[PDB]
Every structure is written in structure tokens, then in C-alpha cells.
Design a protein around this motif. Structure first.
Motif, PDB file in Angstrom:
ATOM      1  N   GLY A  92       0.820  -1.194   0.000  1.00 57.70           N
ATOM      2  CA  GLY A  92       0.000   0.000   0.000  1.00 57.70           C
ATOM      3  C   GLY A  92       0.859   1.250   0.000  1.00 57.70           C
ATOM      4  N   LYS A  93       2.042   1.140   0.584  1.00 59.39           N
ATOM      5  CA  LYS A  93       2.932   2.275   0.671  1.00 59.39           C
ATOM      6  C   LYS A  93       4.231   2.068  -0.098  1.00 59.39           C
ATOM      7  CE  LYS A  93       1.099   2.955   5.335  1.00 59.39           C
ATOM      8  NZ  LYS A  93       0.498   4.300   5.089  1.00 59.39           N
ATOM      9  N   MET A  94       4.157   2.074  -1.427  1.00 64.13           N
ATOM     10  CA  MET A  94       5.350   1.880  -2.248  1.00 64.13           C
ATOM     11  C   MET A  94       6.445   2.882  -1.938  1.00 64.13           C
ATOM     12  SD  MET A  94       4.937  -0.868  -3.770  1.00 64.13           S
ATOM     13  CE  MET A  94       3.390  -1.998  -3.960  1.00 64.13           C
ATOM     14  N   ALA A  95       6.113   4.166  -1.981  1.00 67.24           N
ATOM     15  CA  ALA A  95       7.092   5.209  -1.688  1.00 67.24           C
ATOM     16  C   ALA A  95       7.675   5.022  -0.276  1.00 67.24           C
ATOM     17  CB  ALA A  95       6.441   6.578  -1.817  1.00 67.24           C
ATOM     18  N   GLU A  96       6.806   4.756   0.693  1.00 67.10           N
ATOM     19  CA  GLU A  96       7.232   4.548   2.071  1.00 67.10           C
ATOM     20  C   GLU A  96       8.266   3.438   2.126  1.00 67.10           C
ATOM     21  OE1 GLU A  96       3.975   4.938   0.994  1.00 67.10           O
ATOM     22  OE2 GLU A  96       4.408   6.994   1.640  1.00 67.10           O
ATOM     23  N   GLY A  97       7.893   2.282   1.588  1.00 62.92           N
ATOM     24  CA  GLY A  97       8.777   1.129   1.586  1.00 62.92           C
ATOM     25  C   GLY A  97      10.096   1.325   0.872  1.00 62.92           C
ATOM     26  N   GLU A  98      10.075   2.062  -0.228  1.00 64.50           N
ATOM     27  CA  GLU A  98      11.289   2.290  -0.980  1.00 64.50           C
ATOM     28  C   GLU A  98      12.307   3.055  -0.142  1.00 64.50           C
ATOM     29  OE1 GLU A  98      11.196   4.797  -4.659  1.00 64.50           O
ATOM     30  OE2 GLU A  98      11.881   2.898  -5.574  1.00 64.50           O
ATOM     31  N   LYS A  99      11.836   4.082   0.559  1.00 60.41           N
ATOM     32  CA  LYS A  99      12.692   4.896   1.413  1.00 60.41           C
ATOM     33  C   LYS A  99      13.382   4.029   2.459  1.00 60.41           C
ATOM     34  CE  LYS A  99      13.087   9.546   1.225  1.00 60.41           C
ATOM     35  NZ  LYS A  99      14.225  10.350   1.756  1.00 60.41           N
ATOM     36  N   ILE A 100      12.617   3.132   3.070  1.00 61.19           N
ATOM     37  CA  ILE A 100      13.144   2.235   4.087  1.00 61.19           C
ATOM     38  C   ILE A 100      14.177   1.288   3.489  1.00 61.19           C
ATOM     39  CG2 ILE A 100      12.606   0.292   5.602  1.00 61.19           C
ATOM     40  CD1 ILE A 100      11.790   3.220   6.528  1.00 61.19           C
ATOM     41  N   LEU A 101      13.834   0.684   2.349  1.00 62.01           N
ATOM     42  CA  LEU A 101      14.734  -0.237   1.664  1.00 62.01           C
ATOM     43  C   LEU A 101      16.050   0.484   1.416  1.00 62.01           C
ATOM     44  CD1 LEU A 101      14.964  -3.061   0.357  1.00 62.01           C
ATOM     45  CD2 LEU A 101      14.240  -1.972  -1.736  1.00 62.01           C
ATOM     46  N   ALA A 102      15.962   1.732   0.975  1.00 59.80           N
ATOM     47  CA  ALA A 102      17.155   2.529   0.727  1.00 59.80           C
ATOM     48  C   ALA A 102      17.983   2.608   2.014  1.00 59.80           C
ATOM     49  CB  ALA A 102      16.757   3.921   0.274  1.00 59.80           C
ATOM     50  N   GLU A 103      17.291   2.837   3.127  1.00 61.93           N
ATOM     51  CA  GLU A 103      17.920   2.937   4.438  1.00 61.93           C
ATOM     52  C   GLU A 103      18.583   1.638   4.857  1.00 61.93           C
ATOM     53  OE1 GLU A 103      15.781   4.762   7.720  1.00 61.93           O
ATOM     54  OE2 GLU A 103      14.420   5.686   6.272  1.00 61.93           O
ATOM     55  N   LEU A 104      17.926   0.509   4.586  1.00 63.02           N
ATOM     56  CA  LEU A 104      18.492  -0.800   4.918  1.00 63.02           C
ATOM     57  C   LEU A 104      19.789  -1.017   4.153  1.00 63.02           C
ATOM     58  CD1 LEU A 104      15.341  -3.027   5.054  1.00 63.02           C
ATOM     59  CD2 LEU A 104      16.835  -2.308   6.948  1.00 63.02           C
ATOM     60  N   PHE A 105      19.904  -0.369   2.996  1.00 59.20           N
ATOM     61  CA  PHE A 105      21.114  -0.478   2.193  1.00 59.20           C
ATOM     62  C   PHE A 105      22.199   0.453   2.708  1.00 59.20           C
ATOM     63  CE2 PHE A 105      18.849  -2.929  -1.022  1.00 59.20           C
ATOM     64  CZ  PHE A 105      19.872  -3.779  -1.439  1.00 59.20           C
ATOM     65  N   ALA A 106      21.802   1.519   3.399  1.00 54.69           N
ATOM     66  CA  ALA A 106      22.779   2.442   3.958  1.00 54.69           C
ATOM     67  C   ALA A 106      23.396   1.787   5.194  1.00 54.69           C
ATOM     68  CB  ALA A 106      22.111   3.751   4.339  1.00 54.69           C
ATOM     69  N   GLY A 107      22.563   1.551   6.199  1.00 54.70           N
ATOM     70  CA  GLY A 107      23.024   0.933   7.428  1.00 54.70           C
ATOM     71  C   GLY A 107      22.168   1.424   8.577  1.00 54.70           C
ATOM     72  N   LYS A 108      21.468   2.525   8.338  1.00 55.98           N
ATOM     73  CA  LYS A 108      20.595   3.117   9.330  1.00 55.98           C
ATOM     74  C   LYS A 108      19.905   2.060  10.206  1.00 55.98           C
ATOM     75  CE  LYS A 108      16.972   6.233  10.415  1.00 55.98           C
ATOM     76  NZ  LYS A 108      16.951   7.619  10.942  1.00 55.98           N
ATOM     77  N   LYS A 109      19.507   0.924   9.628  1.00 53.64           N
ATOM     78  CA  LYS A 109      18.833  -0.110  10.419  1.00 53.64           C
ATOM     79  C   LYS A 109      19.347  -1.512  10.154  1.00 53.64           C
ATOM     80  CE  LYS A 109      14.800   2.856  10.116  1.00 53.64           C
ATOM     81  NZ  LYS A 109      13.828   3.247   9.039  1.00 53.64           N
ATOM     82  N   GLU A 110      19.259  -2.371  11.169  1.00 54.20           N
ATOM     83  CA  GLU A 110      19.709  -3.752  11.042  1.00 54.20           C
ATOM     84  C   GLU A 110      18.513  -4.654  11.223  1.00 54.20           C
ATOM     85  OE1 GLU A 110      22.510  -4.153  14.271  1.00 54.20           O
ATOM     86  OE2 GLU A 110      24.152  -3.448  12.982  1.00 54.20           O
ATOM     87  N   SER A 111      17.472  -4.102  11.833  1.00 52.25           N
ATOM     88  CA  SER A 111      16.249  -4.861  12.055  1.00 52.25           C
ATOM     89  C   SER A 111      15.019  -3.963  11.939  1.00 52.25           C
ATOM     90  CB  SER A 111      16.288  -5.552  13.428  1.00 52.25           C
ATOM     91  OG  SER A 111      16.415  -4.622  14.489  1.00 52.25           O
ATOM     92  N   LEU A 112      13.869  -4.584  11.700  1.00 52.54           N
ATOM     93  CA  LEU A 112      12.616  -3.861  11.568  1.00 52.54           C
ATOM     94  C   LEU A 112      11.463  -4.848  11.556  1.00 52.54           C
ATOM     95  CD1 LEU A 112      12.362  -2.598   7.818  1.00 52.54           C
ATOM     96  CD2 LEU A 112      13.375  -4.758   8.552  1.00 52.54           C
ATOM     97  N   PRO A 113      10.287  -4.404  12.007  1.00 52.79           N
ATOM     98  CA  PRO A 113       9.112  -5.271  12.029  1.00 52.79           C
ATOM     99  C   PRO A 113       8.428  -5.201  10.668  1.00 52.79           C
ATOM    100  CG  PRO A 113       8.603  -3.221  13.064  1.00 52.79           C
ATOM    101  CD  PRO A 113      10.083  -3.220  12.862  1.00 52.79           C
ATOM    102  N   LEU A 114       7.795  -6.295  10.259  1.00 48.63           N
ATOM    103  CA  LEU A 114       7.123  -6.343   8.964  1.00 48.63           C
ATOM    104  C   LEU A 114       5.729  -6.957   9.016  1.00 48.63           C
ATOM    105  CD1 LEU A 114       9.914  -8.010   6.794  1.00 48.63           C
ATOM    106  CD2 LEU A 114       9.622  -5.539   7.040  1.00 48.63           C
TER     107      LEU A 114
END
Lengths: 106, 107
Positions: free
Chosen positions: A50-72
Motif C-alpha cells: 500500500g505504501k510503495m514510496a514509504e517502503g522504498e525509502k526504508i529499503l534505501a535505508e536498509l542499504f545504507a546501514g541506518k537499520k539492522e532490524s525492523l518489524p514487517l
């Protein structure tokens, strides 16, 4: 190799674009989808359907390093979402950046 | 897989007896020990150098399913230890029950 295939938790190798370069016996099982299908879908479809833009931003972040874990919330082919937690690690696939994720069904 | 080799975090696959079935460049690199050496060593030599008994029990629980993650003190060839956090998954190498571990250096 045929190893990860032996872990009960869901495992995915994802590329920078959100494409699944790999998944093990558990992802199809728990999601209702098929290995054939999963290998062609975008990770955002299963997660931020439902949130393509939302998810893309996060995915980008997971590639940076900002996060190592997250709920789905994983929407199954069935339609109903199963809550979960994803643990991610950065690695390389074919010499290109990818995310290694081991996901737990809550 | 050749894949795992590409993760900065230490990954080991260890059997019921505590032997190191698999390890990645990350381990030798961070622990100061070698892959050759590493393949012969026992996990407890790295995790419980002075407390084999308490270390032998934890390992026991890990296989039972007791825990999914535990903090660690990895002793480097140097003799010094580093704080770590290890996440474990119960897998099977080829045929026998073993532990799949991804370890984060908490330095």
C-alpha cells in the motif's frame, strides 16, 4: 548451499531494486506464493503493497546501514498479512550490493 | 555458500560437539586466528576459555532451543576479548543437528 534451506525462519536475498535474488523453502510455504512467482516479485509488493514510496525509502535505508532490524507485515497471496520481524545483513551477490534477511514469523 | 563470505559479520556453523563446521573470512580477520586453526578448534576455546563447564551447558541449551541470541566475549589469538552478540538458528549441515550463528562485534 542447500543449507539455508534447512532453517525454519524465512530467508531472502534482495538486491538494491527490491528484487528477490533468492528465497528458501520457508518463504513460499508461509506466504502461499510460489518459488517461481516470488523470484519475479518485488519485495515492496509483499511488504509495502500500500505504501510503495514509504517502503522504498526504508529499503534505501536498509542499504545504507541506518537499520539492522525492523518489524514487517507480509501480505500472502491469500491477502491476509502475518506480522513478523526482519533481521538484515549487507552482502554481495554477483559483485553487486544485496541485503541478506532472516525473517521471523511473530 | 560463497555468499556468506561477503558479510562483514562473523558467521560460524557449529555442530553438537562444538566443532567449527564453517566460518567466514570475518572470523579469522577479527579473532586473529586462522581458518586452518579455526577448523580444528572447539567453539568453547573462543567463548569460554576459563569456564568450559558453564560454556558446555549454554551450548547444550542452544541446541535445545532455549535461546535465540546471547552476548559473548570472543577471545582473540592475542589473548584479549571483544564483546559480541550472537544470533543463532538451528539448522543441519548435511545430516546432523548444528547451530548457525551470525555474530556482531559490539566494539
Amino acid at each position: 548451499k542447500n543449507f539455508l534451506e534447512t532453517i525454519e525462519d524465512m530467508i531472502l536475498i534482495i538486491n538494491r531494486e527490491g528484487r528477490l535474488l533468492y528465497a528458501n523453502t520457508a518463504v513460499p510455504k508461509k506466504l502461499g506464493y510460489t518459488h517461481e512467482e516470488l523470484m519475479s516479485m518485488h519485495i515492496l509488493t509483499i511488504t509495502s503493497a500500500g505504501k510503495m514510496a514509504e517502503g522504498e525509502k526504508i529499503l534505501a535505508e536498509l542499504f545504507a546501514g541506518k537499520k539492522e532490524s525492523l518489524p514487517l507485515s507480509l501480505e500472502k497471496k491469500e491477502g491476509t498479512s502475518i506480522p513478523a520481524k526482519a533481521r538484515i545483513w549487507q552482502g554481495k551477490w554477483h559483485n553487486e550490493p544485496c541485503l541478506f534477511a532472516i525473517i521471523k514469523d511473530l
